[PDB]
Amino acid sequence: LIVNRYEKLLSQRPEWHAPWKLSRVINGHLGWVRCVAIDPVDNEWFITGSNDTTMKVWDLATGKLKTTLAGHVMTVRDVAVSDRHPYLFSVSEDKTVKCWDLEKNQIIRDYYGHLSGVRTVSIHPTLDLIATAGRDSVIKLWDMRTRIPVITLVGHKGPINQVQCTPVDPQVVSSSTDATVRLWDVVAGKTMKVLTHHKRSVRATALHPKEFSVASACTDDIRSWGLAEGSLLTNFESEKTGIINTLSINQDDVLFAGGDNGVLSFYDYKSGHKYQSLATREMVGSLEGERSVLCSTFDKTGLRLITGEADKSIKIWKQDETATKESEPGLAWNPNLSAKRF
C-alpha cells in the first residue's frame, strides 16, 4: 500500500550531516585520475592512478608528492592498497594486475590471465586473494602467492565496472554494464542473488565500513543493498543528478556521489536524503566536459574526502565543523510522489 509508505517516510526525518566544502586542490597529473586509494592503517598518504600511466603517491596532511609509481604502460584504471599487506594492487588496461611491494616500491607480481582490459580490483580483506574484473565480463580471483586465477566467476554479460569484496558471503559484490549487481558465492562459483534493480551500467559499488551493506549507482538512481539477503534498503533521491561515476561511504553514513555533470551529491546513507549538491569548478583552461568527478574515496576517519576529476586535478573536500543543525540544515526532506523512488 503506497500511501502508507509515503506517509511513513514523511513521518520519519533524516539525520543532519555537516556541509562539505573544498579545502585543497592538487593539480599534479598529466592525465585523468581514474581511481584513488588510501592506506587503510596509516593515513600518511594516498595514491591516485591516472591516465598518464603514472600512479602518484600524494600526502594527506600536506598535499605533496612523495613518489611516483610508473610500472604500467596503459591507463591505470583502478588502484587498491591492501589493508593487512604492504602491497598496492594496480589494475590498468595493460591487461595486467601488478602488485607493488610498498616496502620496496617495486613491481613484484604480475597477474596474467585476463582476456581484455581490466577495470577494478577488490582485495578480499580477510584472505590472501584479490578480485580483478574488467571488460571481459568475468571476475578472476587471484591467489596472491601463486599468481593463479583460482576461481573464475561466470555470469555477468557486459563489462564489469566495480567489484567489492566482503569478509562474509556474498564475498564478491560485483556489478557490470548489464545493470546487474551480482552477489557471488566464492566456494560454489554461482551467483547467490542477482540484483537487477538498476537500469544502466552500475559504475559504482561502495562498501559501508560499519554495516554489512553496499551502495550501487546507475544513472539517476543510487540504491543501497543489504548484503545479508540481497534486499533493497533505500532507494536514494538522486533526481536528475547525472551519470554517477563513483560512490564512497563515510563511517558516519555520509555517501558521496560524483556525477559526470560536475555535480556532487552528498547523501545521508541511513535515510536516503540528498542534502548537499556542489558544483565542482573546472580549472582555468578546461573544457566544460572536464568537470566530471571520475573517482573518489574517504579518509579512514572520514573527515576528508578525496576526488580525482577529469580536469587533471585532485580535490579534497572537508566538512564544516562550524555549521550546526540550525545553521546549514542541508536540502529539505520532501520525498517525491511522481517518482516511485520513495
Partner 1 sequence: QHDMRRARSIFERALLVDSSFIPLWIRYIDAELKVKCINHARNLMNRAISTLPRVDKLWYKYLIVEESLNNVEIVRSLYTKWCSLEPGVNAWNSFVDFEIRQKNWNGVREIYSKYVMAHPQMQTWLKWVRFENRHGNTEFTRSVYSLAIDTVANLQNLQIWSDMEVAKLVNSFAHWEAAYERSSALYQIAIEQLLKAGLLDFEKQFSIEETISYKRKMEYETILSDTWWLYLDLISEPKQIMQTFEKAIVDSKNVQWKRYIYLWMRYICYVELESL
Partner 2 sequence: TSHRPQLEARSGAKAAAYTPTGIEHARLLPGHTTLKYRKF
Partner 3 sequence: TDQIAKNVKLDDFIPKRQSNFELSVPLPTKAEIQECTARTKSYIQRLVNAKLANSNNRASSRYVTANLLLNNSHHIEVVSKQMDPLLPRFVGKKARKVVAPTENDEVVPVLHMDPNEW
Under rule CB under 8 A, residue 300 binds partner 2: no
- Distance in angstroms (rounded) separating the CA atoms of residues 341 and 239: 9
Binding test (CB under 8 A) with partner 2, winner from 35, 60, 91, 138: 138
Residue located via cell numbers 580483506: 125
Whole-angstrom CA distances from 88 to 52, 106, 276 are: 18, 10, 33
Distance of alpha carbon 267 from alpha carbon 269, whole angstroms: 6
C-beta of 131: minimal distance to partner 3 in Å? 12
332 binds partner 1 (CB under 8 A): no
> Near partner 3 by CB under 8 A, which window of 110-118, 131-139, 225-233, 240-248?
225-233
87 is an interface residue for partner 3 by CB under 8 A: no
Q: How far is the CB of 10 from partner 1 (least distance, A)?
A: 6
Q: How many residues would you count in the chain?
A: 342
Residue 240's φ and ψ, nearest 5 degrees, are 60, 30
Q: Is 24 exposed, middle or buried (0-12, 13-18, 19+ CB in 10 A)?
A: middle
Which of 88/202 has CB closer to partner 1?
202
At which residue does the C-alpha cell 542534502 appear? 275
Distances (CA, A) of 227 to 37, 183, 185, 270, 336: 23, 8, 12, 15, 27
Binding-site residue total for partner 3 (CB under 8 A)? 46
**All cell numbers assigned to 208:** 559501508
Describe the chain by its helix, strand, coil percentages, rounded to 5: 5, 45, 55
State the alpha helices, DSSP H only, in the chain.
2-11
Q: Which residue in the set 70, 188, 337, 339 belongs to the binding site for partner 1 (CB under 8 A)?
A: 337
Per rule CB under 8 A, is residue 145 in the interface with partner 3?
yes
Tell me how far apart the alpha carbons of residues 196 and 186 are, in angstroms, rounded to a whole number. Answer: 20
Query: Least Å distance between CB 197 and partner 3?
Result: 5
Is 73 near partner 2 (CB under 8 A)?
no
Q: Which amino acid is at 187?
A: V
| Closest separation in Å from C-beta 40 to partner 2 | 9
Q: Is 131 in the site for partner 3 (CB under 8 A)?
A: no
Question: Nearest Cα to 130, choosing from 107, 146, 116, 117?
Answer: 146
Tell me how far, at minimum, the Cβ of 202 lies from partner 1, in Å: 15
Q: Which does 10 bind (CB under 5 to 8 A by kind): partner 2, partner 3, partner 1, none?
A: partner 1
Residue 23 lies near partner 1 (rule: CB under 8 A): no
336 binds partner 3 (CB under 8 A): no
187 binds, among partner 2, partner 1, partner 3, none (CB under 5 to 8 A by kind): partner 3
Q: Distance between CA 32 and CA 245 in Å, rounded?
A: 13
77 binds, among partner 3, partner 2, partner 1, none (CB under 5 to 8 A by kind): none
Binding positions for partner 1, rule: CB under 8 A: 1-3, 6-7, 10, 157, 334, 337, 340
Which residues contact partner 3 (rule: CB under 8 A)? 5, 8-9, 12, 14-15, 126-127, 129, 141, 143, 145-146, 148, 150-151, 167-169, 171, 179, 186-187, 194, 196-197, 199, 210-213, 223-224, 226-228, 231-235, 270-272, 340, 342
